[PDB]
Amino acid sequence: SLSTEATAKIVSEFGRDANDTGSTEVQVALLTAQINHLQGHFAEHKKDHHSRRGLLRMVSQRRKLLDYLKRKDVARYTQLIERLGLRR
Amino acid sequence: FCRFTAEGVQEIDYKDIATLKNYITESGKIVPSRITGTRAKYQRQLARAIKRARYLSLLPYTDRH
Amino acid sequence: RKQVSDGVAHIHASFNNTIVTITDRQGNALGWATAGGSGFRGSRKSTPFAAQVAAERCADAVKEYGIKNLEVMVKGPGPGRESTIRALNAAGFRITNITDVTPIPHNGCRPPKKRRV
Amino acid sequence: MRHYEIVFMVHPDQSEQVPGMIERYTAAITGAEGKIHRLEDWGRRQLAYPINKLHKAHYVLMNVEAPQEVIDELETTFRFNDAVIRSMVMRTKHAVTEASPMVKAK
RNA sequence: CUUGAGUCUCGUAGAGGGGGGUAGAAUUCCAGGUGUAGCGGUGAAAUGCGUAGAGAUCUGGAGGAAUACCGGUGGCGAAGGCGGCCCCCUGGACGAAGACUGACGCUCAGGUGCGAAAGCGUGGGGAGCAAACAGGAUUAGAUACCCUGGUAGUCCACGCCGUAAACGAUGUCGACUUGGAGGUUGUGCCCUUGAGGCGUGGCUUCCGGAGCUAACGCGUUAAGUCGACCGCCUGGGGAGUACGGCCGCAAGGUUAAAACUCAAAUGAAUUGACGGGGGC
Ligand SMILES: [Mg+2]
Ligand SMILES: [Mg+2]
Ligand SMILES: [Mg+2]
Ligand SMILES: [Mg+2]
Ligand SMILES: [Mg+2]
Ligand SMILES: [Mg+2]
Ligand SMILES: [Mg+2]
Ligand SMILES: [Mg+2]
Ligand SMILES: [Mg+2]
Ligand SMILES: [Mg+2]
Ligand SMILES: [Mg+2]
Ligand SMILES: [Mg+2]
Ligand SMILES: [Mg+2]
Ligand SMILES: [Mg+2]
Ligand SMILES: [Mg+2]
Ligand SMILES: [Mg+2]
Ligand SMILES: [Mg+2]
Ligand SMILES: [Mg+2]
Ligand SMILES: [Mg+2]
Ligand SMILES: [Mg+2]
Ligand SMILES: [Mg+2]
Ligand SMILES: [Mg+2]
Ligand SMILES: [Mg+2]
Ligand SMILES: [Mg+2]
Ligand SMILES: [Mg+2]
Ligand SMILES: [Mg+2]
Numbered sequence: 001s002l003s004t005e006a007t008a009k010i011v012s013e014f015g016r017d018a019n020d021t022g023s024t025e026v027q028v029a030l031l032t033a034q035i036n037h038l039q040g041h042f043a044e045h046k047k048d049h050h051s052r053r054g055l056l057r058m059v060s061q062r063r064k065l066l067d068y069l070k071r072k073d074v075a076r077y078t079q080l081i082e083r084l085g086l087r088r
Numbered sequence: 089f090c091r092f093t094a095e096g097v098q099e100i101d102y103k104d105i106a107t108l109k110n111y112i113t114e115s116g117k118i119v120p121s122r123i124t125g126t127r128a129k130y131q132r133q134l135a136r137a138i139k140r141a142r143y144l145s146l147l148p149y150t151d152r153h
Numbered sequence: 154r155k156q157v158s159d160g161v162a163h164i165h166a167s168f169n170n171t172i173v174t175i176t177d178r179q180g181n182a183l184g185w186a187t188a189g190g191s192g193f194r195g196s197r198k199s200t201p202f203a204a205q206v207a208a209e210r211c212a213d214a215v216k217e218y219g220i221k222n223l224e225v226m227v228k229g230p231g232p233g234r235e236s237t238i239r240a241l242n243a244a245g246f247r248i249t250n251i252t253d254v255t256p257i258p259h260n261g262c263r264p265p266k267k268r269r270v
Numbered sequence: 271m272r273h274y275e276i277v278f279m280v281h282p283d284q285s286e287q288v289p290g291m292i293e294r295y296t297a298a299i300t301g302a303e304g305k306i307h308r309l310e311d312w313g314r315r316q317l318a319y320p321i322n323k324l325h326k327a328h329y330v331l332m333n334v335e336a337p338q339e340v341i342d343e344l345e346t347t348f349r350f351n352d353a354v355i356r357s358m359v360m361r362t363k364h365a366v367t368e369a370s371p372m373v374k375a376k
Numbered sequence: 377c378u379u380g381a382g383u384c385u386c387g388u389a390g391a392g393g394g395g396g397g398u399a400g401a402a403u404u405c406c407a408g409g410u411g412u413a414g415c416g417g418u419g420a421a422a423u424g425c426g427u428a429g430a431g432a433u434c435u436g437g438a439g440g441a442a443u444a445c446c447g448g449u450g451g452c453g454a455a456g457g458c459g460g461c462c463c464c465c466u467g468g469a470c471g472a473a474g475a476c477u478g479a480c481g482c483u484c485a486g487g488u489g490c491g492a493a494a495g496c497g498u499g500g501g502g503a504g505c506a507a508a509c510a511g512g513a514u515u516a517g518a519u520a521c522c523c524u525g526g527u528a529g530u531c532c533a534c535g536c537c538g539u540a541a542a543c544g545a546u547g548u549c550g551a552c553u554u555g556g557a558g559g560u561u562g563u564g565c566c567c568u569u570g571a572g573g574c575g576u577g578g579c580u581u582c583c584g585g586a587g588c589u590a591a592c593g594c595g596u597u598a599a600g601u602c603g604a605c606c607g608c609c610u611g612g613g614g615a616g617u618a619c620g621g622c623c624g625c626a627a628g629g630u631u632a633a634a635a636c637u638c639a640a641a642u643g644a645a646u647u648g649a650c651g652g653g654g655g656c
C-alpha cells in the first residue's frame with residue numbers, strides 16, 4: 001500500500017495537528033494518494049479484478065467522505081478539492 | 089509431537105538439512121503431521137523448507153534419481 | 154559372450170501381459186521373453202504360471218552369460234509378480250534386491266477415462 | 271532496500287572462480303549501498319541428484335540488504351553466466367548475520 | 377457528545393489477484409545403444425503395431441500440459457473460485473495498545489462490475505485427453521456395448537457469451553437469548569520457563585437446551601426473540617413457452633403471458649411389501 005513515510009508526510013500536510021490522523025481531509029488525501037498510485041498498477045494489470053475491487057471500494061469511500069465534508073462545511077471541502085484537484 | 093513449540097524456533101529454515109531428514113521418508117516424501125505430531129503451522133513451514141531444499145538439491149525429490 | 158554374475162531384471166507387468174527382460178548395470182539388454190511369447194493367449198497369457206514359464210525361458214535364454222545374482226525392477230502391478238521373481242530366485246540367481254519402479258507422475262498428464270459398466 | 275538470501279551453485283570445475291565472483295558481486299552490492307550481512311562458502315558438496323549430468327557442485331550463500339534493482343541486475347548476471355549452474359534468491363524478513371548449519375557443521 | 381462507522385502506529389496468518397522466471401516427476405515423440413518376434417488390446421479376438429528392428433531397456437534431445445508426498449469438510453476470497461518453488465506489483469482480514477475524525481451509518485429499484493463449464497470471434501499453440509467422426513468385434517438394420525484410432529475442444533492472447541443442483545436449495549445489516557466438544561489463527565498474564573497453566577479475541581466443525589418447525593430438523597455461524605431495507609411466491613400442466621421489447625456475431629439470454637386442461641399436483645413422516653441381498 002502506502003509507505004509509512006508517505007502517510008506521515010500526508011498527515012503532516014493536511015492534518016490540523018501532528019497526530020490528527022482521523023480528520024476527513026487526511027483520510028481523503030490518503031485515499032487520493034493510493035488511488036493515484038494504483039492508477040499505474042491497473043494500467044498494466046488489466047485482468048487483476050480482485051484488487052480492482054478494493055480500489056473501487058476506496059474510491060467510493062472517498063466519495064462518501066467528500067460528500068459528508070461538503071455538506072458539513074463547504075469551505076474546507078472547496079479547499080480540499082482544490083489542493084487535490086478533484087470533482088472534475 | 090509438539091516438537092517445534094518445545095524448541096521454539098522462529099522459522100524452520102531450509103538450510104538445516106540435518107533436522108529435516110527426520111521429517112522425510114527414505115523415499116524422499118514428506119511425512120504427514122498426524123504421524124510426527126508437529127503443529128500445523130510448523131508443518132507448513134517444514135513443507136516450504138523441504139521444497140526449497142529439494143530445489144537446491146540438498147534433499148532428493150525421490151530415490152529414482 | 155561375457156560374464157556378469159550379478160545382473161538386473163525388469164518385469165514390466167501389465168494386467169494383460171507380463172514381459173521380463175534382463176540387463177547388467179548398463180541397460181544393454183541380454184535376454185527377453187514374454188508370457189505371450191510362449192503360445193499363450195487371452196487370459197492364459199496373464200497368469201502367474203505364464204510368469205513362471207517366462208522367467209524360465211529368459212533365464213535359460215541368457216544362461217550363456219551365466220549370471221548368478223540379480224536386481225529386479227518390478228514395474229506395474231501385473232497379477233502375481235512375486236511368482237516370476239521367485240521363479241528366477243529358484244532359477245539359480247541370488248536376488249540382491251527388489252525395486253518397485255512403477256512410474257508415478259506428479260499429476261503430469263490427464264489419464265484416460267476408465268472402464269464404464 | 272530489502273533483505274535477500276542469495277544462494278548459488280557453480281560448476282565445481284570452475285571452483286577457482288568463486289573467490290573473485292563473490293568479490294565482484296558484493297562489489298556491485300556495496301556500490302549500490304548494499305550491506306552484505308553474511309557471506310559463506312561451503313566449497314564443493316555432493317549433490318542430492320544429478321544436474322546436467324553432474325554432481326558435487328560448489329555452493330555459496332550470501333545474505334545481503336540492497337535495493338531490488340541491483341539484485342535484479344544480479345540475477346540477470348547469473349542467468350547470462352554459465353559457470354553458476356543454478357541460483358536462487360529469496361526475500362527475508364530481516365537481515366540475518368549468524369552461522370549456518372553448513373559452516374557450523376562443516 | 378463517542379458507544380456506530382472510519383483513520384494512523386506495531387505486528388500475524390493465508391492455494392486472495394496480476395505479471396515473469398524456474399524445478400523435478402510422468403506421458404508422447406525424436407535420436408541413437410543393447411537387444412528380437414511379439415507388442416498392444418479383449419469375453420475372445422480383430423482393426424492396429426513389429427523384421428524398414430518394434431515391444432522391453434539405456435543415454436541424449438524436443439515439446440506441451442499439470443503440480444504426487446505435504447494435504448487436513450486446513451486456509452484464502454463477495455461469489456465463481458484459488459495448490460511446486462522464487463521474484464515483482466497488489467487487494468482484503470485479524471490482533472495488541474494507544475491516538476485521531478465525530479453519525480461520516482444500514483439497505484438498495486433502475487444502474488455498473490464480477491461471474492464454473494460448455495460455446496462464439498481472431499490469432500496462436502497443441503503432449504495427454506477427447507464430443508463428433510472412422511475402423512474392428514456386427515442381427516429382420518446398424519444403433520447398442522467394448523475396443524483401436526481420432527478432429528473440434530481442452531491450453532495462451534484479446535474480444536464476446538452471462539448461464540449451472542452458480543446449493544448452506546437458507547438476502548444483507550444490527551441487537552439479544554442456557555451449554556459441551558473440537559479445528560485454526562492471534563494475543564495478555566503466569567507457574568522455574570521451555571514444555572505446561574490461567575485468560576482474552578477472529579474464523580471455523582460437530583453435539584445438543586429453551587424456543588421454533590407440518591415434520592425432518594434448526595439450534596449464539598438460528599430455521600430462536602426483534603428492528604431496517606430489498607428480492608420473490610399465490611393450485612398442477614400448458615410454460616419459463618408464445619408474442620413484443622432489450623441484449624448478443626451466433627448459439628441464445630433476459631422480461632413474460634393467455635387460451636385450454638386437470639381436481640388434484642406437492643412436502644415431511646408412518647406401517648408394510650420390495651428375496652436371483654446379508655447375518656443368526
Ligand atoms: Mg486501507
Ligand atoms: Mg498468491
Ligand atoms: Mg523428463
Ligand atoms: Mg530403440
Ligand atoms: Mg472464509
Ligand atoms: Mg497485504
Ligand atoms: Mg473532540
Ligand atoms: Mg439490480
Ligand atoms: Mg462484464
Ligand atoms: Mg472455457
Ligand atoms: Mg476458440
Ligand atoms: Mg484456432
Ligand atoms: Mg484416445
Ligand atoms: Mg473412445
Ligand atoms: Mg462404429
Ligand atoms: Mg457406447
Ligand atoms: Mg477468454
Ligand atoms: Mg437461474
Ligand atoms: Mg459450486
Ligand atoms: Mg436459488
Ligand atoms: Mg445476522
Ligand atoms: Mg477461541
Ligand atoms: Mg443441533
Ligand atoms: Mg460456536
Ligand atoms: Mg434469522
Ligand atoms: Mg421455516
Ligand SMILES: [Mg+2]
Nearest residue numbers: 611612613614
Ligand atoms: Mg396456473
Ligand SMILES: [Mg+2]
Nearest residue numbers: 616617629630
Ligand atoms: Mg425463452
Ligand SMILES: [Mg+2]
Nearest residue numbers: 618619620621
Ligand atoms: Mg424473443
Ligand SMILES: [Mg+2]
Nearest residue numbers: 622623624625
Ligand atoms: Mg438485434
